[PDB]
RNA sequence: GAAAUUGUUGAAAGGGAAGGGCAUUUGAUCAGACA
RNA sequence: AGAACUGGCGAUGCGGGAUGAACCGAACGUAGAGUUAAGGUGCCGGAAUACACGCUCAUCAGACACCACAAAAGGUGUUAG
RNA sequence: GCCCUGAAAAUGGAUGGCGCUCAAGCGUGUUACCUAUACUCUACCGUCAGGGUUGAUAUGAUGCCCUGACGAGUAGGCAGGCGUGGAGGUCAGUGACGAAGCCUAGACCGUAAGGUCGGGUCGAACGGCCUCUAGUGCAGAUCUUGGUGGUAGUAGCAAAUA
RNA sequence: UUUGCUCCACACAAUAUAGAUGGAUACGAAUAAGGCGUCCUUGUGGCGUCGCUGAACCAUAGCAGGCUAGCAACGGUGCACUUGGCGGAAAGGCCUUGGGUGCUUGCUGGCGAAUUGCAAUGUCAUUUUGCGUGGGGAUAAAUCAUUUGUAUACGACUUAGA
């Protein structure tokens, strides 16, 4: 049967599985599209 | 010469069997160059070897052979059947077996 | 398969044997199975039957 | 139902002794042999007169062959089919070689077209066309203009092995 | 058509026997249509059923004919006394056909051996199957079993 | 050295175990006839075990017969040794497992005299 | 006959194809498919994109990891065809699977080998004039195929240098056509066309 | 001083059971006749 | 749910219908050889990706008795009358 | 006639699956081929039936030999045999030079119930056959008594201030 | 942790196999169209020719392939070297130069075979490991424990310490 009334769902479904990640140090999945008329520059950087 | 062939390919294909029952005693072989029954009556009764590798050296070789014959046609596609002395084991399913020229009837 | 019409291994219902164990009763029919079966005479087949019935199948005379 | 022939049969249902000499009577039977010859004759007289197969007999049956099998005719076939709903009539023309030819082809077309099977047709009459201008029918008029030219595009050649070395070429 | 069958001495599949074509068999024939194959065989086919798959009823055993001395033994006195007088009284059915035909044991034929010739066998062999009145194409279908 | 008779066939070189047997260690190797309304076995299904049957009977030629030929027959002193003197082709003397070693060197010794042979020579001897 | 069969997926269908290497793989021969992204499929394309949304939705209800696969790739497409015809599950069609690799495009050393094709399931032999097809490549990048530029521009790269290999093995091959054409008109030119030579 | 059950040693197999039937390969092992 | 005739299951395995106590074929001692039934011959799967005449394109095609569903009514989709 | 609309149910989904489009679909025809414990032939086992044979000096007349047909099966009936405890008779039986019992992917015989042998262990009685007798054969009965497992080194050993 | 480890030349033992026994012989594209040759104004050109299967092509003769002689060619091929270029999609291959050496059945010769006794595959693969040969080559880490808290039920994680 149907619930009683309709409820949102509870949390993301695409943050999943919420696991231990496989590092301390996040990885950099994406990077900017390349456009090669602008110089020669970094895309990211490091800190604290 | 740099050929010594004397015998012609095969295959070994299945046992002789139904839908959902086999019978191990028949097998059944596929002549290389062969698609009519019509000539596949050659080959009745020619000797049929399998030649295999064993671990264990008996006769001063590790080369063990398996002997058997052709009996009749099988299907309209030139394949064969054979019977040999001991069935073959089952496992060689697509191995290739030799088929040699004599009884000759030439 | 075969249609049977009548009962398959079916005994003949009668005997062919004393269930006696007289061992001159014996003698009396191992003398006339010889006798009926060389003689072709129609007396000699009714006392074999008649040496095979039961007390009850033999009165007294 | 199967590569058919064509017969003769005669019937003569049994002369009583209040009335010798029957009319002899005769149809044409399309047929595979002379079992179902016989077997088709009565079916028809027993929807003309009034006879069956016990009350009659067989005269003759002969095979009726074709007088000029080698040339090709034009043929006009009257057909009486029984459908899932009603009977109907229908008038088909074949272009084939014999009259035997011609109903090989009828069977095949009534039962592509139309669901019929063989218990379902009755042949009333084949005829060949003597003239031309005559044939009514589209898909026969097509073959009788002066001439014929077609082509075969797209040859499918069949082969043999089951791996070939080159790419095949449908040309003709 | 079980007890029309056991009357015919046909108890098994493929079993073949003779029968006299009167009123009163024709409608014996009638009743087992669906079960059985019949017709009229030649001189040809009799012959070579007789010299196969001949065998007498003597003595309520099966023995098969192999002489003229054991069909003279048991049928001498009709007549018949070799392998040959026999297959006369079948094909031409004399005085003496009712003792000729109980003598001879039931056939026991094979299956044929190039098949039955349709894809289904219990149908009419008008309507394209094998049972039913099928005259002298029987020749063909007997000697293929036998 | 047996008299010359054909070859033997059995027809069933298997023993025949019971329904069961290598499941359970209280079932006995010992072969019972399935008695359940629902068993596969006494129904004869496919897949399963064979059931013993008259079908599977020897040949009466070659019956009780050794490999080499012979009759088994158990000798237990020289007195019963002696009645297989005239058949010496047909039987063979088997030493009884209760006789002493002391006497189955009288018993070896009496049949290679008579030239009967022994099926267990190599019983309890001395080495 | 050859040790290892090289055939090109260009022009063919699937179950046609599947059907014909299923049955060769069983009998012992090691078969390499090649250029898996040019296969044709009968109908027309959206009846075939249909027919993948719907195998898409075919999960395990609690678990969407354990369910079905459904794999992207052209070579894996194919391999999904083939595999249904084959008893994978046994011992047998489990050593088939591994006398046959197929791939997008034409890779490394079977590039300089020859490719085969079958009669029995190319497109021109077996549709008829006027039906239409739909092509793998096509079909496999509307449902999730990241690579069809990739294999695109690689294919592009090796027919060049493809043409050129052709360029000097025609040259050369005219040479030979006219060397023995010069020993031609000789005895022994006639002797050989005596025996069929 | 048996079985259930357990230890050690030796041999063999193991991709979500194990066990079974028919056939053969491989390994181990056994027999016969040598007349 | 309750009757009439007959055949089956129960009490029965075997080949076929993927699968099933009743359906189809056919009933069973132990083996060998040959031929078939019912059902099948693209692959799984033993056997013609046989031959021949036509029909059908479906944005939920269709695919074999018992059998595991489909109708009235419509279509200038196409075919024949 | 085929196809399409009409034609909407809840886990993901089933012409058996893959897949198939001048089909590997549908209607129909012609042949070839695949094989059931079915049919035909042969051998063997058992049953039943019909017969042959007592002649001594060599041994089974319930014996031997010849011929033909047959072989499914629960409840049930009958017949032929295997095994156990004890009793009469017999083998002038076996045994401290090792009886009985037990162990043995060691061997042989019987269709089977079972029987026999070799090896290891063991220490004092036991068997074959002809007959008699019965408290005579177990996988089950939430069976009885006794013993031992998986669970498992798991639950747990936390009230009353230390 | 008693001279171990690594690459290379061969040496012997084992070990494993889904199955070597003349050659996997490389354009692309179209199919109501193309391949090749040739010519020109180089084109969506003109002309000739080919398909209808790989039933092709190459290779193929010698004690499974010996020992030697000559002739005609200056070719063909095997082998270890050597020169240069190309190939990154899984390149691990392809092309080419220089000689050395072996063979040549292109042609003509001379000897050798038997007895393995009338058929019994008649053995001719690479896979890994191990123990002994010697020609070069290289002289480390991780874990526990201690410690830290960006981490933590326990493991794990993040740090630090000659």
Redesign the pocket.
């Given at each position: 049967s149907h619930r009683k009334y309709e409820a949102p769902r509870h949390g993301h479904l695409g943050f999943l599985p919420r696991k231990?990640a496989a590092?301390?140090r996040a990885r950099v999945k994406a990077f900017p599209k390349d456009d090669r008329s602008k110089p020669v520059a970094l895309t990211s950087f490091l800190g604290y | 010469?740099?050929?010594?062939?004397?015998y012609v390919?095969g295959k070994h294909?299945?046992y002789?069997?139904?839908?959902?029952?086999?019978?191990?005693?028949?097998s059944?072989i596929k002549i290389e160059g062969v698609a009519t029954?019509q000539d596949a009556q050659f080959y009745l009764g020619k000797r049929i070897?399998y030649?295999?590798?064993?671990?264990?050296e008996v006769?001063?070789?590790?080369?063990?052979?398996?002997?058997g014959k052709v009996?009749?046609?099988?299907?309209?596609?030139g394949?064969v059947?054979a019977?040999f002395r001991?069935?073959?084991?089952?496992?060689?399913?697509?191995?290739?077996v030799?088929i040699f020229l004599?009884p000759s009837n030439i | 398969?075969?249609d049977?019409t009548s009962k398959?291994?079916?005994?003949?219902g009668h005997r062919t044997?004393p269930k006696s164990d007289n061992v001159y009763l014996?003698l009396l029919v191992?003398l006339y199975?010889?006798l009926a079966?060389?003689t072709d005479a129609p007396f000699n087949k009714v006392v074999l039957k008649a040496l095979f019935l039961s007390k009850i199948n033999r009165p007294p005379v | 139902?199967?590569?058919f022939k064509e017969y003769q049969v005669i019937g003569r249902r049994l002369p009583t002794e209040s009335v010798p000499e029957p009319k002899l009577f005769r149809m044409r039977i399309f047929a595979?042999n002379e079992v179902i010859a016989k077997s088709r004759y009565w079916y028809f007289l027993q929807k003309l007169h009034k006879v069956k197969k016990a009350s009659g007999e067989i005269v003759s049956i002969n095979q009726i062959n074709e007088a000029h099998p080698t040339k090709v005719k034009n043929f006009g076939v009257w057909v009486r089919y029984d459908?899932?709903?009603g009977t109907?009539?229908?008038?088909?023309?074949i272009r084939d070689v014999s009259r035997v030819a011609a109903v090989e082809?009828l069977?095949?077309?009534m039962?592509?077209?139309?669901?019929?099977?063989?218990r379902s047709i009755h042949i009333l009459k084949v005829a060949e066309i003597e003239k031309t201008a005559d044939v009514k029918?589209?898909?026969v008029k097509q073959f009788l203009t002066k001439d014929l030219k077609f082509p075969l595009?797209?040859?499918?050649?069949?082969?043999?092995?089951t791996f070939?070395?080159?790419?095949?070429?449908?040309?003709? | 058509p079980?007890k029309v069958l056991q009357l015919l001495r046909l108890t098994?599949?493929?079993?073949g026997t003779f029968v006299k074509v009167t009123k009163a068999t024709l409608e014996l024939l009638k009743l087992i249509e669906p079960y059985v194959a019949y017709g009229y065989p030649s001189y040809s086919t009799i012959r070579q059923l007789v010299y196969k798959?001949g065998?007498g009823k003597i003595?309520?055993?099966?023995?098969?004919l192999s002489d003229n001395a054991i069909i003279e033994a048991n049928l001498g006195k009709y007549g018949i006394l070799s392998i040959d007088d026999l297959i006369h009284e079948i094909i031409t059915v004399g005085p003496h056909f009712k003792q000729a035909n109980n003598f001879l044991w039931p056939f026991?034929?094979?299956?044929?051996?190039?098949?039955?010739?349709?894809?289904?066998?219990?149908k009419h062999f008008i309507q394209?199957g094998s049972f039913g009145n099928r005259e002298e194409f029987i020749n063909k279908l007997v000697k293929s079993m036998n | 050295?047996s008299l010359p008779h054909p070859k033997?066939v059995?027809?069933?070189t298997?023993?025949?175990?019971r329904?069961?047997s290598?499941?359970?260690?209280?079932?006995?190797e010992?072969?019972?006839k399935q008695?359940?309304?629902d068993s596969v076995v006494?129904?004869?299904?496919?897949?399963?075990?064979?059931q013993?049957?008259?079908?599977?009977?020897?040949?009466?030629?070659?019956?009780?017969?050794?490999?080499?030929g012979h009759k088994?027959f158990?000798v237990?002193?020289v007195?019963?040794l002696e009645t297989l003197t005239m058949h010496t082709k047909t039987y063979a003397a088997?030493?009884?497992?209760?006789?002493?070693?002391?006497?189955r060197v009288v018993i070896l010794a009496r049949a290679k005299a008579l030239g009967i042979?022994v099926?267990?020579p190599?019983?309890?001897?001395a080495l | 006959?050859?040790?290892?069969?090289?055939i090109?997926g260009?022009?063919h269908?699937?179950?046609?194809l599947?059907?014909?290497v299923?049955?060769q793989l069983?009998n012992?021969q090691?078969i390499?498919v090649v250029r898996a992204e040019?296969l044709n499929?009968?109908?027309?394309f959206?009846?075939n994109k249909?027919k993948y949304h719907?195998?898409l939705?075919?999960?395990?209800?609690?678990n969407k990891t354990?369910?079905?696969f459904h794999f992207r790739a052209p070579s894996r497409?194919f391999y999904?065809?083939?595999?249904?015809?084959?008893?994978h599950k046994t011992?047998?069609?489990?050593?088939?699977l591994?006398?046959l690799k197929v791939?997008?495009?034409?890779?490394?050393?079977?590039?300089?080998?020859?490719?085969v094709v079958v009669?029995?399931?190319?497109r021109?032999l077996?549709?008829?004039?006027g039906?239409?097809y739909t092509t793998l490549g096509k079909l496999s990048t509307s449902v999730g195929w990241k690579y069809e530029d990739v294999?695109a521009k690689?294919?592009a790269?090796?027919?060049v240098?493809?043409?050129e290999?052709?360029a000097k093995?025609?040259?050369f091959t005219?040479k030979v056509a006219s060397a023995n054409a010069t020993a031609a008109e000789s005895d022994v030119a006639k002797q050989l066309a005596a025996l069929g030579?």
């Open positions: 231990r590092s301390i | 010469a740099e050929s010594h062939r004397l390919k294909l299945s002789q069997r139904s839908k959902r029952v086999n019978n191990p005693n028949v059944l029954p070897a030649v295999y590798r064993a671990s264990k006769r001063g070789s590790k080369i063990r052979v398996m002997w009996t009749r046609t099988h299907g309209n596609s394949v059947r019977t001991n069935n073959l084991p089952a496992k060689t399913f697509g191995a290739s030799r004599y | 398969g075969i049977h398959q291994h079916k005994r003949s044997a014996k191992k199975t010889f079966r060389r | 139902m199967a590569h595979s459908s899932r709903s109907h009539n229908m008038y088909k023309e082809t069977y095949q077309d039962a592509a077209r139309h669901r019929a099977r063989f029918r589209q898909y595009p797209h040859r499918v050649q069949k082969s043999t092995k070939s070395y080159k790419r095949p070429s449908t040309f003709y | 079980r098994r599949i493929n079993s798959r065998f003595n309520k055993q099966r023995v098969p026991k034929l094979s299956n044929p051996s190039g098949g039955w010739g349709v894809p289904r066998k219990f394209g | 050295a033997i059995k027809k069933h298997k023993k025949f175990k329904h069961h290598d499941r359970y260690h209280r079932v006995a010992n072969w019972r008695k359940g309304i006494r129904r004869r299904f496919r897949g399963n075990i064979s013993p049957k008259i079908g599977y009977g020897s040949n009466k030629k070659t019956k009780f017969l050794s490999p080499s088994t158990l237990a002193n007195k019963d088997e030493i009884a497992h209760n006789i002493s070693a002391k006497n042979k099926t267990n190599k019983g309890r001897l | 006959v050859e040790p290892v069969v090289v090109d260009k022009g269908l699937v179950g046609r599947a059907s014909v299923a049955k069983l012992g090691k390499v040019e499929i009968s109908g027309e959206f009846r249909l719907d195998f939705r075919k999960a395990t209800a609690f354990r369910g079905p497409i999904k065809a083939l595999r249904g015809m084959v008893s011992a047998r069609g489990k050593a088939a591994e006398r791939f997008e495009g034409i890779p490394p050393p079977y590039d300089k080998k020859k490719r009669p029995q399931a190319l021109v077996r549709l008829k004039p039906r239409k294999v690689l294919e790269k090796r027919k240098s493809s043409a290999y052709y093995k025609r040259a005219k030579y």
